Amino acid sequence: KLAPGYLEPADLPVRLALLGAPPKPGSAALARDEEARRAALALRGSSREKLAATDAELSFPGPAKTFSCALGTQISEKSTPHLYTLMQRTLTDAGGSTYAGKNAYNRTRPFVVHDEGTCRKDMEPLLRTDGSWPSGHSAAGWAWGLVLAEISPARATELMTRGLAYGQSRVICDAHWQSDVDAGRIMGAATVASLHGNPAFLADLAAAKEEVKAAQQAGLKPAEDCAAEGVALGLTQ
Amino acid sequence: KLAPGYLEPADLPVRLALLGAPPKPGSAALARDEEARRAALALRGSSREKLAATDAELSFPGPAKTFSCALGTQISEKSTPHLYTLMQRTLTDAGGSTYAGKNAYNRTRPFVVHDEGTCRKDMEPLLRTDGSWPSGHSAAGWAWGLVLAEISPARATELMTRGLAYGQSRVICDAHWQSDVDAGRIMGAATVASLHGNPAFLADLAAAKEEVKAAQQAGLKPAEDCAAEGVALGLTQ
């Protein structure tokens, strides 16, 4: 159910070297995670939580739909085949697929710690047994934001903001801690640096730039309710 | 003093859109900043503090020297002129000179809040009146780490680790808060994404890849004490 990643395992960024240990028990860092959790759970029942629910969808075309409004055009196999492929393959590179248990911290997720629910009840049987470190959604979101921003520089701010919000959706969903979302962005940026050393990624990147240019010049607007996503995001950037 | 940046002002990543507010008074987020400050000040008098003192040097060849050991060859005008230039110009893009006080938070630095000293007494007269948001050293450190990792993919982990440590040196030096160092990496990664859309940067990047490869193949060792830097950093293989 996973596309081949661009990167060989030996070329993946090394979590242990790049990341610090998770917040220790009794630490202010852990208190910051609980504070972020409490602030996030205040949004339970809101449109932002509902957007966090669709942000959790990693099965394509999930991510493609999620980033279309920020891109200004629809990401699809028909319109942007190379960009679509790039997002699928970089999900493997940046996401939870690389986060093995060996040489990794085991992270008990917030909703398990506090015996409460998430914004995606259907994904919980998987997440309960999952202690991935850091947040793979966060890493993929930031990686997607950084690559897409390079693909369409005229929408760089919208795309990078959307990629950051994608990681924040994991806190709002009560699926992972703030610190793991923050650490996810370190891995996401690092993975993008490695991808720029990969000729296969670079070829798809170059083709995606032409696809997006062609779609925007032809006036293809996103096939998503960008108004509703904007409201859910709050914007006021 | 400052080299021309690659990026036009309109192409700089927008701090206000990408970053959250600084830790509020009485918050666990602020408590985390104080906790990191206390852990950092325990290293006063140590080799790690001494390395943070040279990590503070933004006047070239300061940054070139700082990353040479992680690169595996000396960054110099003679041996890697385009890489040297690239670091100088990306210092302007990423390194805080763009952090205008207008439309930005004013940050009182830790050593000012606690009427104490930094690891660089000579730089305090400027830093005392400076409330830059986030950490420009951190942003440049992470940006340099990410670009250099693409330049020399075989040393990607060493270089990205060094770029994160470069930002952490600001906490160890008591020059800025942890949260501003963390936010610095968001801006650094964003700036790198913008840089990959800039043809002048891309031309220097391609030449730097050839310069570094030629230097490493000729066996040009770093002209820095890599043993001493390894001990000060606590490096683990």
Author numbering:
A (entry chain C), B (entry chain A): 38 to 274
What wording appears in the published article?
M2‐32 is a non‐specific acid phosphatase with a rare ability to function across a broad pH range (3.5–8.5). Analysis using SWISS‐PROT Prf Profiles classifies it as a class A acid phosphatase (Z‐score: 78.97), sharing 50%–60% sequence similarity with enzymes such as PhoC and PhoN. Although the monomeric form of M2‐32 has a molecular weight of ~28 kDa, size exclusion chromatography, dynamic light scattering, and sedimentation studies revealed a dimeric form in solution. The mechanism of catalysis of histidine phosphatases involves a nucleophilic attack by a conserved histidine (residue His 174 in M2‐32) to generate a covalent phosphoenzyme intermediate (Ishikawa et al., 2000), followed by hydrolysis to release inorganic phosphate that requires protonation of the leaving group by another His (residue 213 in M2‐32).
The first disulfide bridge forms between Cys105 in helix H4 and Cys263 in helix H14, while the second bridge links Cys156 and Cys210, both residing in the loops regions. M2‐32, however, presents an additional extra bridge on the opposite side to the active site of the enzyme. DSF assays suggest that M2‐32 is a thermotolerant enzyme with an unfolding T m of 47°C and, accordingly, this high stability may be conferred by the presence of two sulfide bridges in the monomer, which contrasts with most acid phosphatases that have only one disulfide bridge. Mutations at these positions resulted in over 90% loss of enzymatic activity, highlighting their functional significance.
